[PDB]
Amino acid sequence: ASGVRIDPTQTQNLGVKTATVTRGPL
Amino acid sequence: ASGVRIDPTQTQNLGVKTATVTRGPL
Amino acid sequence: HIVLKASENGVPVYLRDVAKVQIGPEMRRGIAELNGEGEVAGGVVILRSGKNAREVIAAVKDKLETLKSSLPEGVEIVTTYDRSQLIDRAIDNLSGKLLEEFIVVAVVCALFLWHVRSALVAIISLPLGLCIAFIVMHFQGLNANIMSLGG
Amino acid sequence: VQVIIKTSYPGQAPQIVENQVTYPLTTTMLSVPGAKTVRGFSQFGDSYVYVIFEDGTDPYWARSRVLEYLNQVQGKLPAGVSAELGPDATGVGWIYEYALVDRSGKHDLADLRSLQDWFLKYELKTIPDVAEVASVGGVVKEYQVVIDPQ
Amino acid sequence: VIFEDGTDPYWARSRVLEYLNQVQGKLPAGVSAELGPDATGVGWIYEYALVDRSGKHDLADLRSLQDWFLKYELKTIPDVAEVASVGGVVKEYQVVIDPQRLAQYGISLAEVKSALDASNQEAGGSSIELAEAEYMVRASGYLQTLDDFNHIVLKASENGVPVYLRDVAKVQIGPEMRRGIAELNGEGEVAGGVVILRSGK
Amino acid sequence: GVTALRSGLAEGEKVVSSGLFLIDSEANISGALERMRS
Amino acid sequence: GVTALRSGLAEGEKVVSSGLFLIDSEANISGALERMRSES
Amino acid sequence: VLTVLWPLNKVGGEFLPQINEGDLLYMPSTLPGISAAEAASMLQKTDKLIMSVPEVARVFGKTGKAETATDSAPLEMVETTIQLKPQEQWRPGMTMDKIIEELDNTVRLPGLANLWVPPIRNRIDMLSTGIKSPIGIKVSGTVLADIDAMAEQIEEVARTVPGVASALAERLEGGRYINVEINREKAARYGMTVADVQLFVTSAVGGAMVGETVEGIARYPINLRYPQSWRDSPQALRQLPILTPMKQQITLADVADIKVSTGPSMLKTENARPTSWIYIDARDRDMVSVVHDLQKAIAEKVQLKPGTSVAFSGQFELLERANHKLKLMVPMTLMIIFVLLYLAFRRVGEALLIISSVPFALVGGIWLLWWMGFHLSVATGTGFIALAGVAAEFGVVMLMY
């Protein structure tokens, strides 16, 4: 399986943030 | 497998140097 | 008002003309955090290689009492590591053991030697055995630690 | 028994520090009378050399020995740099450790680092048998002239 | 400096060093008094010459072999004070200036010397944070090619036409001034190396 | 030593008088500030 | 503070912006990165 | 004697009994690239989790190094110091090893390999062998990429081992670079020397100190630098504004190519040879069993390269040295004991009969160790030496009658 699994508590502690990918001009 | 949660955001409870926004002349 | 350039007129161009001068932090090469609720400024006391920690820590803690006055209001020195606590715990332990063995053997060499003067003979064999040892360590340079006491 | 050698080579890359400061240093220290092993740390602008002596070596003998070998190598280093002799102690010498906190906020991180650097450090180092009182963490006040390119 | 009988060798060195401190100032500004090795001429123990009979390696190639490889593979040996290179050629980047071109291009010797000095260093720009990682800003600048020498800038017109070091001089690889010469069996110059032993070893 | 504001804050708001909270040599001011919210 | 890609992703997809280093490190250690390169 | 063979094949071996000190140090490890801002955030998050355990009373976290030569830590390295409440306050069913388990199980982040040690023990180990952990492996060689490949394989075989909790080998070239490759010909166009251009790198971009204000006894650094917006990123550097000597207004890209690259992060050297240290953390098992199990997995699942060597160092290096001195130490003790008996009684076959009484004393010691659940160590070894002299003491007072 491609990728890697990580305990949701660790990531929550890490303060993981995510940004959605869009298309448009820079 | 500890579900022990922590606040990830930065913390500063050991003292803050503060000023209040004032209306006055330069 | 660092001068950079000057016209014949006498009109100068200053450092304030090409830049803002501010008070900022230098590049941190070390960061200290206390109890997970704030960055702090700390200090560590380093001991010379062959010197006594317990001896030094005393002077350090006593010099800090002198400074509680000189320190600004609101300033608190919270200790984050103190090897003196271990020394005490380790040397009180070995002391205790010595005392216990002494009293345990006496009790035993007194149940196999019913007479008290007989038991008290093998009993005076210890406190004096200590003395010679400690007087020797003194000429040697050996201090009292779990290992030297454990011997 | 350990003698530390700290050389500062500012702005220079790790590989350059290793080639022009650390490597020359370690190879001359390895052949110091009584040297058992020698470790080198080449960072971005910093060189750390740790000289470990064999058992029974008089600590001061060792320092005095490193110092003279440090003299016959000072030239083989880049012009700006100088090989500094570390303190008398080691990491094991760290004995008492504390933090400075002002809970009212009346004093910030820079105010306290200054308190440590210019008051406390000097009130403690006077104490016999103390090699160093080192500041850890805090902010060093810097006068930063920020130039506008335009 | 020769000491009297029974003087602890290290005592002596440590003693000379402190007297070397209280004299460093009484010397000309540029100069510095360097402490010699621990050994003496008597310490010369093992001595060899480097020869390549095919010619594939010349005198400079072998002096470099000695200076930058052998010297360091031997000095690691305990009780060894020094591994010294003897004879051979030290590769020198010799900028040979044409006096006439200096006049034709209106560039003084002093200007050439200054340009050189500003064209052989690296610089650090601290570091920049990308993806929470530390990116070290590293600036090149080390002279490492003959072309690099040739393209030392000396002068520039408003037009943007520069005058290079190649304009007033030829940059060649030559021998440095030999301060020592080694010969083997009366049939060739060679690059050698001597192993010096610590005094009481 | 004091800067005037054309807009941004309201009279009375408390503010911390320190840029001494982000490392100079290289915290990305943009993201080093982000770490303070959520 | 924004960067444009010529390719590699698809709109709607989610990407990590904070705690990115450690998470990447984990993926590096767990062999995920090597797996990513081998597939194509 | 044949009965002492059962406890022998049962007990394990350590260099010394793990002495409990009031406090302990958290010394995790990570990949070479981490930034200071991030590492300092890692430190606070890690500290809150440690403090969330009831046994710890204080947590003094540290990233980077303190201002002394006795500290050469990178800003990417964390050395937090944990103080534990008096043993009279620990939960009823608690031990030091049980506290560490809650710590190692509570305080964990992705890509972060934790390590828990006693302060004094740690400082002694790093000074003696360099390794911060009880178990250590040293990959050496002269090709950074080679030793790194080696350490990478070893690190992963190490985690397959039953008793290992974490294993991380520091990389020798996982560093990130932004190279300003100055173009002599391009710069010459504007009458600029390499040194001319570089000033913008060390001062405009980098914040190189330029001077120091004097303030009584104190001193503070002065520096020059462009606002951050100009030096935000590679693309930003490519547009770094430059005022040339001839007052031409150009960008940095006009005189240089700026390229991101990878290279040395930090050059560890031991006796003038590059080296990478793998930090292994096993605390359930005994050391000797783990090292021997590592030595197997490594030898079988990792084919060595030419100029690359692997060595086990850490306390194990000390254990081996002490053992060699002890195995040579028994004959000594056995010939001298033999002579003192030989002197008092004067009888050969009889003195030989007394010294032959100590093997029975040994078996008594081993069985007690096993029952107590102890391991063989330089401590127990000492005890057995001293115990021999006491069993030979008895032997004499039993023969004299």
Next chain:
Amino acid sequence: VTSAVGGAMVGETVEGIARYPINLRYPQSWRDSPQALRQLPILTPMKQQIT
């Protein structure tokens, strides 16, 4: 004298661990002999061409 005539070292190229000397000098023909030195070409600060 130190550079045109003599071959005084001026700098050193850095090449890994190694270092090699850089120098400046007129071709030998200009510094062959006393008489040669008496005609050693000099470009003055004011661009005067003298010996």
